[PDB]
Amino acid sequence: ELDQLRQEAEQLKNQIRDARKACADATLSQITNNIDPVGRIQMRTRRTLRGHLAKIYAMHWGTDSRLLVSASQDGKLIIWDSYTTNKVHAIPLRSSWVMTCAYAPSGNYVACGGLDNICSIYNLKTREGNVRVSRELAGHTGYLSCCRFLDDNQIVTSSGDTTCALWDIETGQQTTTFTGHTGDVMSLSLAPDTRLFVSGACDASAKLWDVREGMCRQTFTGHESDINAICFFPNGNAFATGSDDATCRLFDLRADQELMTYSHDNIICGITSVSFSKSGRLLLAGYDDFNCNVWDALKADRAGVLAGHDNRVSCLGVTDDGMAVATGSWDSFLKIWN
Amino acid sequence: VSAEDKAAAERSKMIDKNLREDGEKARRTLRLLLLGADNSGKSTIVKGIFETKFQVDKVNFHMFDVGRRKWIQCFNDVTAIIFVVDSSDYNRLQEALNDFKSIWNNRWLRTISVILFLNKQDLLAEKVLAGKSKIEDYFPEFARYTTPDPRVTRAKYFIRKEFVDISTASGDGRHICYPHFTCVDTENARRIFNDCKDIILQMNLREYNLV
């Protein structure tokens, strides 16, 4: 009889919890009690980039740590040389309603998408001297919320239709679909090996996905409200999440659980962005009250604040050499800190 | 700087000029968000997303419709929200108040005013004169309400009070609601311009410290 499926699900919901609690011998704070503190940090603004006419919704760093791309309500992508501030290209969008952009790890291509349910791929290396669309990827039934390249021929995307998907750009078709979330999917992060990825959704959970097998490995469920941003730890063995809960949380793959949470009684607004420094010792988070907090990832202390925007911070990112932090905002600027 | 760097700097001046020139043309316009449930007449109040454009009295408008908890943050800087209500069914009319109370109180829409079209007044006049059913079975206060045709005037004013009440009870002064009735009607492009003029005038008084 069909009602017995709820009985079998209850037995397993107990067995997962019993296994996870048997591992819990000591906390990360009980181990890291003797390691020395970061002290205080004092990063300063080294550049301001100007030229968008409206809100900035996303940015992404290029593989060489010198180029970056930005996406805005004003209907343009812009590619910047961060050292000089010079604009390299400005690209006109076919819709104003973009929510995402990404840079290919070769520097040959850029991607964007949003409320029109399509992901567009732009070729930066034409013989005619232009930038133009190479491919339009269509098949989601809702707004695209994040995208990330694996190479010049494969890309992963997430949407408001509750799925993620993997695409072959040369064929213009899906090769796998990833199914199991019950809310809209907000954000996505690839592991350093590119064999796995994680995503977070408005049902207040995160999942671990096998790219090659096409299926779900583990699910993580500590939050009490929607997840907006997610990021792998540099070692590929842990990740962090940020939520409308007004807290960040660190999760471990091999212990299958939460290690610690970052929060304070004077912090009340939701988290828009999260990122890790090159050693993993600093965790950076962006907030709806328009400045960034910097946390000691092991001690859970707060080390300093990047105060400098006068409207909310919408995107965040650290260079692969660990030299600098970029932040974008609804004030139409983006700033670089060091 | 080198001979390549001064050439790459002159390129960026032409990008700055061409971005800024395209910034003047867009800022001429006004932007509208359109909302309303199925069979409300939303597609014909003027005659993954849809967009339509018009001009009246030398002012020109863009209007958007989506084929909403997350994406509504993208519309935090429109001039107005247009909200369309079916008045021909008394049964689903509670869903119209439930949707309206969500959009009015939303934390990212604290400064945007609403233009409200109560649609299908002809099917409402036909049913209130035919007399087979009564609003009072769904909204009991109609059994005691009387006016501020002599039959239909009682119904249409009561139904229009039910939206304006749930607005004014928590409006917080920054934004306003502008009701109208729609049928083969044609004037609706003038009605929205006469309210977009008033919204911009209400902003100009606060910027000059008059209010």
Epitope: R66, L67, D81, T84, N86, V88, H89, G107, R127, E128, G129, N130 | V1, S2, A3, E4, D5, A7, A8, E10, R11, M14
Partner: single-chain antibody, 230 residues
Framework: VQLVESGGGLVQPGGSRKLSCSAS????????MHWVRQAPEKGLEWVAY????????YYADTVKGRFTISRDDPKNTLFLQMTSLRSEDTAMYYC??????????????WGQGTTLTVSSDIVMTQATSSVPVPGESVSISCRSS???????????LYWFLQRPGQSPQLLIY???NLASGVPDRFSGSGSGTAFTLTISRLEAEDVGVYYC?????????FGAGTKLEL
């Protein structure tokens, strides 16, 4: 992608001319444009430059005041107007496209020229004049009077290849980088002042002439270049 040219011919001393060149298949307004010349038995020499947006214009001292360079973007056309023509101006003239931003490769494509017959600069040298070369490696070297390496971390040296009877084409840009469609058997490297190009496994159709050019400062200057033989 194409550039085509008209003008040239025979001119009596002291006269004037206009050359014209028409682009097709590319975003012409976005490219900087150069005129480059060669005498009937001598190396490449640069004549003039005009920017994108017409905002800056350069000449060598041998043409300064006698020549005007101009463009007509709605018609995709490049012009050179020149007066007081001497026997010393008798040259093949080519136009060239260029574009400048982080990661670009200028001197990318060349027209096919019109021959004209009239009846503090960086000195750079190629040590050989001609070399006997198949299947073996071959190597060529160029030296500069001053350093081509700049505080920004780049070196502004280029290598050009000319096959017999054909316009020249780019091999290498900014000392190290290889131009699109050029075989992976080509390479080059150097110090701040002395540079080398290496060919691995030489073949037919690699036979030609090799020119080294600097782009540190205007005027742009060339070496004499080295010929190869089979």
């Amino acid at each position: 992608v194409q550039l085509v040219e008209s003008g040239g011919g025979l001119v009596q001393p002291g006269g004037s001319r206009k050359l014209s060149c028409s682009a097709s298949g590319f975003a012409f307004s976005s490219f900087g444009m150069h005129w480059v010349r060669q005498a009937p038995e001598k190396g490449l020499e640069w004549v003039a430059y005009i920017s994108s947006g017409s905002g800056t214009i350069y000449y060598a001292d041998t043409v300064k005041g006698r020549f005007t360079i101009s463009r007509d973007d709605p018609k995709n056309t490049l012009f050179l107007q020149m007066t007081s023509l001497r026997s010393e101006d008798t040259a093949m003239y080519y136009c060239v496209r260029s574009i400048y931003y982080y990661g670009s490769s200028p001197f990318d494509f060349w027209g096919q020229g019109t021959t004209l017959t009239v009846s503090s600069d960086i000195v750079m040298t190629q040590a050989t004049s001609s070399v006997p070369v198949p299947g073996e490696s071959v190597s060529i070297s160029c030296r500069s009077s001053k350093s081509l390496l700049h505080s920004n971390g780049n070196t502004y040296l280029y290598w050009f290849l000319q096959r017999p009877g054909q316009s020249p084409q780019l091999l290498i840009y900014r000392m190290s980088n290889l131009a699109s469609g050029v075989p992976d058997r080509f390479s080059g490297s150097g110090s701040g002042t002395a540079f080398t190009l290496t060919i691995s496994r030489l073949e037919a159709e690699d036979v030609g002439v090799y020119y080294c050019m600097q782009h540190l400062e205007y005027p742009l200057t060339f070496g004499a270049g080295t010929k190869l033989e089979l």
